[model samples]
Target: SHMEEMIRSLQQRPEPTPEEWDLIHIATEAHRSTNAQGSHWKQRRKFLPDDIGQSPIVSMPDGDKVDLEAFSEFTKIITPAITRVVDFAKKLPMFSELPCEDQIILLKGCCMEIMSLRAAVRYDPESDTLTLSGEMAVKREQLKNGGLGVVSDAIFELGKSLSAFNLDDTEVALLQAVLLMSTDRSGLLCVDKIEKSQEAYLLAFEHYVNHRKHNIPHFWPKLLMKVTDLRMIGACHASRFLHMKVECPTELFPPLFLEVFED
Candidate 1:
């Protein structure tokens, strides 16, 4: 896989460059902080149950083992890019007040937080690019089965449960769009299913917006478009069962989001 190739390439490289070394340091620091303060810290820390004063190493599926040293190396390659983005984000007033170290910490924290999200996008080491395929496709399936699908089913179930509340054509169309946005390419949605799902979503959104005193958050419009775009790609995959014409909005979509979803 590309990730394995990347690791091999890194291992084959001679001495780590200054930038690479910085990335390693940042990654190491990020790892330490996460192990100490992250929500999963307790579970992870349990590896050091005995007074061994050392953490246990874990093995990847490839039979390659990773310890702190390997982790640091991996981080070294990835940190510079992460830090650069963090510094850029700090230009915003909301983040300007944060210290440099804090900014880096926050960057790492966000990275760790959305690791699964990043996987939704795919990375092709052949082109040195990430994509939302293979494992990421599987994740989309899991997400659909676990949550998005449930949401769709719930919306339809709600419509069925309520007689007075009827989803009109426009509302149904919108709901179909939302359902299309939530689909997993690993599974197929028939046209009828798609349309009905869209209808349900539109009805739900309309109900939330008009009757339930629910307002779309400031960030939702942009976020929704992104989700729509990704879902469209996934849908195309299912429809075509191969690569097709999928829009890639470079300006509107963040590379980080691709990375997040690539998982």
Candidate 2:
């Protein structure tokens, strides 16, 4: 039965369609609104946190010391992006059809993973910083000093790798959609349906890649490989945040951050 469903869905849309373009447009605009400065200038939704630069940098009395203040600043900066991510996922076709429980579960599982990819896209090697928002920048040393240590370095490396490929907005958007629709998240009761959606997005991504970069057949595989890498980095982030939660003030851990990262 599963095989029949898979085959039917595979044949349903072998080629990208206008609907795929709609997904692309939605995802692209979501990415822009989340990451690009001034993208949400008019009628800005007030739900997004005004936590940018809210956390002050603590005195690094000792060299390379772990400062909860600095780390919390990093956490607070991404809150707005998290809200945008939820909005973006809700806009995807099959995603909103899932039970509310399943939809929340999927978002909880992949939010950090998607953030890692966004971090890569936001990375500017020219200045060695990750721009979390229009007015905020996280330097490599700042992350390191904030007790992130090697995770900081790993993120920079990932950024440079993707920067080499020079991913366009549409490509990043498709990748985000594909990553979000994975069926392997734990406790998922609707794996079969989610799997079908995953395959659809993957096919759309593959088609878009080939359609644009006809000569580079390996490009798709190369980009897909980063999915695993992002997952690993996302795990590192969860563990690191948990450690910080234990050692830092409770106030540093936002309710939203804890909800998403705390298992």
Candidate 3:
């Protein structure tokens, strides 16, 4: 129904410029190292069960299940992702050009959104799990017991829906950039500036999609719908975090996580 986005537009090459290419490249390269998608080395080394032997499992302690304590472990794994996202943002010329306060505000506004995207990209449908890194796989039980409960399921559903799109690295990277540079974020002093940047990414995204999958009708509009899904997931996660904090006022949250998610 988004006929506005459905309007026809095309370029001769339908390719991003060198600067825009660099923006997509930086995120693609950085995320390769940070995400579990590159866990091929680990996967290759792992052998199928011979009945007598099993792959080594990294298990968490069962003590204090269904509380902030279990959930804190999830935060620990997420902490590094926050730093990596910051690093990705710093590499963006558009992002670095903003005033320092605006930079912080942008990060605060979109960190969880990016994290949800990351998790969705790494989601494994077979196990119903989100891999945090090479070593840490967040299973359904951990999420349910760790105070995440239904929020975890929502993320899984997001991942499942996104999987239908079969997004490649460039598409995923561009999507992340589009989300980060969104102009609607609160407290943005440089909305015009951000809008300009977002427009660049959006055009690049549209062009790249048209270039790669021109045969598929209405593809770009459909994929962009996930951005709305992510925003709702972000809102749900924030509310759950607040509820957790209230339930356990004495427990300490990860400082970096709190900095980004705390209201």
Candidate 4:
């Protein structure tokens, strides 16, 4: 809603400043690294903790599955993409000048969801599978043993629906910046201040899109609503991880997940 109100208000003829340009550069690179690379998901999967090649057969109801690579695979895939985002954000003057507490809050609140949006880009609704690598495709059913039990199904359904948005790299790139600056995140000390900061980045996107794509995709309301989509999915992520700790072995979970999701 913040971005929606300001998206048009900031669309006047003011050219982007060097700082705004830097933010743009950050977003563009964030988009490129995850979506542009053919091995994007594949490259990141290596960093996530999974039992892909482990031994000691564990049987499930469906039969003898690999028993490895649960939906936490998505977390791993998303973490690397957002790691770059944090690195990029820290470099920006707008972000660096902020109070350290706000900075962490902003990143913590937004990073997971931005990763979700990126992961959503890879969702194949028709197949009901989340793609992790060029060669590897994991079925939604395969993740049944993962976190939150039946909740996993809801995440995939959300993913499939999000994919229907068919967001281009540009749309997703700007979204990363916009969502990162959201004031709605829990524990923000100054919601108005964060809301104002969120505006500038979104304004830059609107301005950039005018020249870049010659237009926009989802309108103000829907584009803004996607923020909720991401956060809701993020909620699912948190719920699943917390529940998963009891259901599966900690060693099988991604190492970073405990730190990342612990908050």
**Between prediction 1 and prediction 2, which has the larger lDDT?**
2
TM-score on alpha carbons, each prediction: 0.22, 0.79, 0.79, 0.65
**Could you tell me the TM-score of candidate 3?**
0.79
- Using alpha carbons, what is the TM-score of model 1? 0.22
Worst 10 residues of 2 by lDDT: 41-50
List lDDT for all candidates, in order.
Answer: 0.32, 0.71, 0.69, 0.60
lDDT (tens digit, per residue) of candidate 1 on 24-51? 3343343333221223322222121122
lDDT of 1 at 200: 47
**Worst ten-residue run, lDDT, model 1?**
129-138
User: How does residue 71 of candidate 3 score in lDDT?
Assistant: 57
Better of 1 and 3 by TM-score: 3
Q: Write the per-residue lDDT of candidate 2 for residues 131-176, one digit (tens) a residue.
A: 5544455676666666666677788788888877778877887888
What candidate 2 gets wrong by more than 4 Å, as runs, is: 1-15, 38-65, 214-217
Stretches off by above 4 angstroms in model 4 are 1-23, 34-82, 125-128, 133-136, 148-155, 158-166, 189-192, 206-218, 246-252
Scanning candidate 4 in windows of ten residues, the lowest lDDT window is 47-56
Q: Could you list the CA RMSD of all candidates, in the order they appear? A: 25.1, 7.8, 7.6, 7.5
Q: In model 3, how many backbone clashes occur?
A: 0
